Structures are given as structure tokens and as C-alpha cells.
Amino acid sequence: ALAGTIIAGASLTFQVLDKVLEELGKVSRKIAVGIDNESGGTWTALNAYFRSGTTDVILPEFVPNTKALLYSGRKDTGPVATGAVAAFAYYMSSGNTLGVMFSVPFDYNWNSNWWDVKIYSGKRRADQGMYEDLYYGNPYRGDNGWHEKNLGYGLRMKGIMTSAGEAKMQIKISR
């Protein structure tokens, strides 16, 4: 298992995201998060806050360049079908922050998954208004394709997620 840790981004791929969540102990519902630092400088993971569900792992605090982190998000103990939602923030080498959250519902054909990623010049965490500015702002619903949009005036986020309970979630930060 490699969930709740950091590894070389040069070796981080979809097969690795699956391997991590597989060896962890995948329950009824779960995810696989990976944010690849390819900008050019060292980052600092602020903290992680579990809004709904529970998780057997812990997010790192330091993420140097050329390396990515690993995280996950399950539905409670397993036999309980509440939800799986959490939010976290990552301090870039330049002093900016990038908000990141996940939302996994219970109902396959009666709900959908949600997530938001943006890079803004400042310091913020998932407390109340920050998590809302992501969830209620504009989620990407897990459109099952590579989504990327120039917004950092030079770099941006490039990621994919599906509209399923067991979705993968990678974020490839590049120029």
C-alpha cells in the first residue's frame, strides 16, 4: 500500500493510482488522489479535513518538486452508506494556494460525484467558506475526460475523474 504518502511523479500513472487504492483495502466506495508537482519548486500541504465518510490514511505536510502525494477517501467503516467527502489545500513554492476537494455520493443513478481545483494567490483552508467556494462554486462532475484550462497566467491543473463511486482523481500541474 502507498496511500497517505509521497513518491516520484516520474513514476506516477493511472495503474499506480489503482494499485494504491487496491492494496490499501478498497471497500464499497473509495477514491485515489494524486497531485504531481511539475512547476519547478517545493510545496507544503496545509492540511486535510474529512467532511463525510472516514479514511484509514493521513496526508503529508511537505511535497518537493518532481514528486507527487497520494491520498484516498472511503465510505465510513464499510457497512454504512452515509457519504465520502473531504477537502484539503496545497501551498505552492511561490506562496499561492490551490484548493482541492472530493465528493462521492451513495446513489449511482440518483446522484453524481463532484470536485473542484483552482490556483489562487493567497492562503486558505477547507473551514466553511473555502470548501463552499469549491463545492457550490463550479464542480467538474467527473466528466470522464482530461480537463485543463489556462488560469494561473502560465501554469494550470490537468485532471480527470469519473461519475462513479470508485473514481480515480489525478492533477498534473504543468506550464
Q: Which grid cell sits at 65?
A: 518538486
140 is annotated as contributing to ligand binding? no
Q: Which grid cell sits at 165?
A: 463511486
91 is annotated as contributing to ligand binding? no
**Dihedral sign for Cα atoms in the order 66, 69, 70, 72:** negative
Q: Which grid cell sits at 15?
A: 495503474
**Helix/strand/coil (H, E, C) string of 4-25?**
CCEEEHHHCCHHHHHHHHHHHH
103 is annotated as contributing to ligand binding? yes
52 is annotated as contributing to ligand binding? yes
| 83: helix, strand or coil | coil
Can you give the length of the chain in residues?
175
85 is annotated as contributing to ligand binding? yes
Give the list of residues 6+ apart from residue 12 with CB closer than 8 angstroms, or none. Answer: 34, 36, 68, 170
**CA-closest candidate to residue 64, choices 30, 41, 94:** 41
Q: What are the binding residues for phosphocholine?
A: 52, 85, 103, 105, 131, 135-136
Q: What are the binding residues?
A: 52, 85, 103, 105, 131, 135-136
